[PDB]
Amino acid sequence: MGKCRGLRTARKLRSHRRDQKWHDKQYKKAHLGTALKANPFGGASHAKGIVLEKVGVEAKQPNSAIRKCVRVQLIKNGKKITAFVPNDGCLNFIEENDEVLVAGFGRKGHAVGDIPGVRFKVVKVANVSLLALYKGKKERPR
Amino acid sequence: WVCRKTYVTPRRPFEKSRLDQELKLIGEYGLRNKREVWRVKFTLAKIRKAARELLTLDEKDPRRLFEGNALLRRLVRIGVLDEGKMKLDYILGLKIEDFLERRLQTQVFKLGLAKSIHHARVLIRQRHIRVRKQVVNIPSFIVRLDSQKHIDFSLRSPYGGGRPGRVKRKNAKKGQGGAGAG
Amino acid sequence: KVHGSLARVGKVRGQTLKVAKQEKKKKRTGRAKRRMQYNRRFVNVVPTFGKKKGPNANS
Amino acid sequence: DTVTIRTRKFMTNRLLQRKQMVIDVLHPGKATVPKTEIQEKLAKMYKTTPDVIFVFGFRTHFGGGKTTGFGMIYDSLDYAKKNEPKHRLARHGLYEKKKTSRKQRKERKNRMKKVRGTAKANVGAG
RNA sequence: UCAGGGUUCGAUUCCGGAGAGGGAGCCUGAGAAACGGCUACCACAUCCAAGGAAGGCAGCAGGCGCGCAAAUUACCCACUCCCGACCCGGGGAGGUAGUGACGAAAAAUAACAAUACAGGACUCUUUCGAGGCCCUGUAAUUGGAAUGAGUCCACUUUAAAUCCUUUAACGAGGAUCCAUUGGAGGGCAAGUCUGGUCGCAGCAGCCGCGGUAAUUCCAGCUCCAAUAGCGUAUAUUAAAGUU
Numbered sequence: 001m002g003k004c005r006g007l008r009t010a011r012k013l014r015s016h017r018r019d020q021k022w023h024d025k026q027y028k029k030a031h032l033g034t035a036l037k038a039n040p041f042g043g044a045s046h047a048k049g050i051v052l053e054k055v056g057v058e059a060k061q062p063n064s065a066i067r068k069c070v071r072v073q074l075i076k077n078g079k080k081i082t083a084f085v086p087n088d089g090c091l092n093f094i095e096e097n098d099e100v101l102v103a104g105f106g107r108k109g110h111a112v113g114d115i116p117g118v119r120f121k122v123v124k125v126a127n128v129s130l131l132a133l134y135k136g137k138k139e140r141p142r
Numbered sequence: 143w144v145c146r147k148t149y150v151t152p153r154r155p156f157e158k159s160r161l162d163q164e165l166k167l168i169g170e171y172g173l174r175n176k177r178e179v180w181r182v183k184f185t186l187a188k189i190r191k192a193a194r195e196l197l198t199l200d201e202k203d204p205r206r207l208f209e210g211n212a213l214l215r216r217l218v219r220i221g222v223l224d225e226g227k228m229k230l231d232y233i234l235g236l237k238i239e240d241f242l243e244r245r246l247q248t249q250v251f252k253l254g255l256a257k258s259i260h261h262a263r264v265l266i267r268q269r270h271i272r273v274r275k276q277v278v279n280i281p282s283f284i285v286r287l288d289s290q291k292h293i294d295f296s297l298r299s300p301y302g303g304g305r306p307g308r309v310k311r312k313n314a315k316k317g318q319g320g321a322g323a324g
Numbered sequence: 325k326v327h328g329s330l331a332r333v334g335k336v337r338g339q340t341l342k343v344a345k346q347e348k349k350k351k352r353t354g355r356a357k358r359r360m361q362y363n364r365r366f367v368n369v370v371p372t373f374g375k376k377k378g379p380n381a382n383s
Numbered sequence: 384d385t386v387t388i389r390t391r392k393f394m395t396n397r398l399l400q401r402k403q404m405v406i407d408v409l410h411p412g413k414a415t416v417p418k419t420e421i422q423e424k425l426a427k428m429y430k431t432t433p434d435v436i437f438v439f440g441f442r443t444h445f446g447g448g449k450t451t452g453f454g455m456i457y458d459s460l461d462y463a464k465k466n467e468p469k470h471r472l473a474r475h476g477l478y479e480k481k482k483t484s485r486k487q488r489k490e491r492k493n494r495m496k497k498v499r500g501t502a503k504a505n506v507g508a509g
Numbered sequence: 510u511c512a513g514g515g516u517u518c519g520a521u522u523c524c525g526g527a528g529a530g531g532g533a534g535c536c537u538g539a540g541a542a543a544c545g546g547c548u549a550c551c552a553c554a555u556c557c558a559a560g561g562a563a564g565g566c567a568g569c570a571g572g573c574g575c576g577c578a579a580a581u582u583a584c585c586c587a588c589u590c591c592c593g594a595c596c597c598g599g600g601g602a603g604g605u606a607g608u609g610a611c612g613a614a615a616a617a618u619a620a621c622a623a624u625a626c627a628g629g630a631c632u633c634u635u636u637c638g639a640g641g642c643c644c645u646g647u648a649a650u651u652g653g654a655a656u657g658a659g660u661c662c663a664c665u666u667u668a669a670a671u672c673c674u675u676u677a678a679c680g681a682g683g684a685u686c687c688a689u690u691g692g693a694g695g696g697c698a699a700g701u702c703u704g705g706u707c708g709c710a711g712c713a714g715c716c717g718c719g720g721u722a723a724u725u726c727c728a729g730c731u732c733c734a735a736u737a738g739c740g741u742a743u744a745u746u747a748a749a750g751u752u
Binding site: 326330331332334337338339340341342343344345348351354355357360363364367368369370378379380381382383 | 616617618627629645683685687688689693699702703704709710724726727728730731732
C-alpha cells in the first residue's frame with residue numbers, strides 16, 4: 001500500500017521495479033558480470049592448476065587444529081588459489097609440481113567451517129580420485 | 143523424439159507418516175519399488191486435475207459434455223468406476239487402491255490360481271499365463287473389464303498341457319544316465 | 325604424550341588396528357528386501373506398551 | 384507341423400500386372416518357417432506356380448502363434464523381371480551384382496577427371 | 510519451473526536471416542556481389558632445379574591446439590527425396606551399423622512344500638496344561654517344481670548383416686549364474702553398542718563434535734534411506750508476500 005493504483009500507471013510501476021531490483025545483492029552480481037572478472041573461475045564448475053607448495057593453515061577459535069592445505073596456480077589465468085585437501089593422509093598422495101583438479105566447497109562464494117581464507121578444495125590428482133587413493137582400490141600410476 | 147516422465151518424487155524427503163503408507167501398500171501387492179507406486183499416483187492426480195476443471199465449466203457447455211461422457215466410459219471400461227455412478231463427482235471419490243485391484247498380478251491371485259502374491263508375479267514373468275490368446279510378461283497390464291473372463295494359463299507350459307520343464311526331464315534322464323547308465 | 329610432531333598426517337589411521345568379519349551370507353535385493361521389511365515391522369505382530377525401542381538396539 | 388495360409392485385403396493391381404495381398408500365417412507349436420515353403424502353398428491356392436510368386440516381411444509375434452508378411456503374385460515372369468527391384472529377384476537367384484563393393488569407383492573417377500582425350504588406361508589400368 | 514499472477518532459458522533437427530581466414534572488386538547466368546567461381550591487397554601456410562607454381566575442412570570422417578567439457582579416416586543409394594539429355598546414371602543429402610549410465614520407457618537378482626521353534630483368534634480344562642486354526646519369520650537340512658542370464662545349430666530380419674521376436678541342444682541348491690551408493694547427535698528416516706585416538710589426527714552445508722568414560726573422529730558389528738542407480742561441484746527455478 002501507499003503507492004499508485006492508477007489505470008495508466010504501467011510506466012511508473014515498471015520503471016520503479018527495474019530500479020529497486022538493483023538494491024538486491026544477488027541480482028547485482030549476476031547482471032554486472034563483476035563476478036566473472038573478479039573470480040579465479042570463469043563460472044566453470046571446476047578448474048585445473050599446478051601445485052606450488054603445501055602449507056599448514058590454522059583454525060578459527062574455539063577449534064584448534066592444523067588443516068594442511070595446498071596452494072596452487074592455475075593453467076588458464078596464472079593466478080593463485082588456496083585449496084583444502086580432504087581426509088587423513090590424502091596430503092601424501094598429492095606431490096609438489098603436479099597437476100590437480102579443484103572445485104568449490106558447496107557454499108558458492110564464502111569460506112566454510114572454521115577454516116578461513118579457503119574457498120576451494122581438491123578432487124582429483126591425475127585422472128584418479130582421492131577416494132580410490134584413500135581406500136586402496138587404485139594405486140599411484142607412477 | 144518425444145519422451146516424458148510418468149512419475150514424480152515427494153516434496154518432503156522423509157516423513158514417518160508417509161513412509162509407512164508407501165511401505166505397507168507395497169507389501170500387499172508385491173511391488174518392487176516406490177517408483178511403481180508414484181507412477182499410479184501421477185496418473186490418478188492427473189485425472190483428478192482434469193475433472194477439477196470440468197466441474198467449474200458451465201453446465202451444458204459442449205466441451206464439458208463430450209469430455210465427461212467419453213472419460214467416464216474409460217474409467218468404467220477398466221472397472222475402477224461403476225455406471226451406477228456415472229457423473230464427475232465420483233471421480234474425486236476415486237482413490238489409489240482401486241487401480242491396483244485391476245493390476246494383472248492382483249487378479250491372478252484374487253480370482254485365479256496362485257499361492258501368496260509373491261508367487262503370482264513370478265508366474266507372469268516366467269510365461270505361464272495368457273490374456274485371451276496372448277502371452278504377457280508385464281504385471282502392470284492394467285486389465286480391461288471385458289478381459290477378466292479370459293484370464294487363463296498358457297497353452298504351452300508344464301502348467302496344463304505342453305512340454306515339461308528341465309527339472310522334471312532332467313530327473314527322468316537320471317533314471318537313464320544317472321542310475322541307468324551312470 | 326605426542327612425540328614426532330603433531331603436524332604429522334596419517335596419524336590416527338596408521339596406528340589403528342584393521343580387522344574384519346566379512347559376510348558369507350547373501351542378502352536379498354529388489355522384491356524380497358521389501359517383503360521382509362513389511363513382515364518384520366508390521367505383520368509379526370509383536371507391539372506392547374509405550375516404549376522407545378527403535379528398530380535398532382545394540383544397547 | 385501343419386500350418387495355415389490365410390488371405391487379407393486383396394487387390395488386383397492391373398497397372399503392374401500383379402495381385403498383392405497380405406500373407407497371414409499361423410503356426411501352432413513352431414513359428415518362423417522358410418519363405419520358400421510358404422510360396423509353395425500359395426502356388427497351390429491360385430495355381431500360378433512358384434517362380435512368379437515373391438514374398439517378404441514375416442515378422443513373428445511374441446510366443447509364436449502368428450507371423451504376417453506381404454506377398455506378390457505376377458501373371459507372367461517378364462512382368463516381374465521388368466518391374467521388381469533387383470535384390471528381390473536376386474533373393475532367389477537369377478541376378479547378382481558387380482559392380483563390386485564400394486570405393487573403387489570414386490578413386491577411379493577423380494583419376495579419370497585429371498586426364499583428357501584418353502582415359503582408357505585408368506578404366507583398365509589404374 | 511509453476512495454485513492464481515510470474516520467473517528463467519532459447520548455439521541446437523521447423524521457418525526467416527547473416528557468413529564462409531580478414532577486406533574489396535568482378536565474370537557467367539533467369540537467379541550470385543557465389544567462395545566445392547575468379548582477381549587484388551592484408552594475415553597465414555606448401556612445393557621449387559629458386560626461373561616459378563599451387564591453397565582456404567564454420568561439408569562427412571580425421572589430426573593438432575584450447576580447455577572442467579564432447580564419437581567411426583565404418584557400410585550403402587534399398588528406403589526418403591533431389592539433380593540430368595533420363596523408366597537405365599549420380600548424391601558422406603539421407604538411410605544402416607559402431608562408440609554412448611546426457612536423458613526417457615520396460616522390470617530379473619528365488620518362488621513353493623516337509624520338519625523345527627515362534628505368535629494370536631478358536632476349542633477342551635477351575636486354572637495349569639493340551640488340542641487346533643490362521644499365518645509369520647527363523648534354524649536345520651532337504652525335496653519337488655519353474656525360468657532367462659549366458660553359450661548356441663536353424664529360421665527370420667536387411668542393400669548385405671547385426672539386434673529384436675521365433676525355435677533345437679546345454680544352462681540355478683545359494684559357498685555361487687554374488688547390488689551398489691550414502692547415512693545413523695539435532696535439522697531428517699536409523700546405535701547414550703565394542704576396540705583405537707585424546708583439542709592431536711579428523712569430521713562438520715548449518716548448529717557443533719575431539720583437552721584419556723567421543724551416541725558425531727578412525728575401524729568392527731548392527732540398523733536406516735533410495736535402488737540399477739546413488740553421491741559431489743556449478744548455473745537456474747520453486748520455497749521467497751526476503752522485489
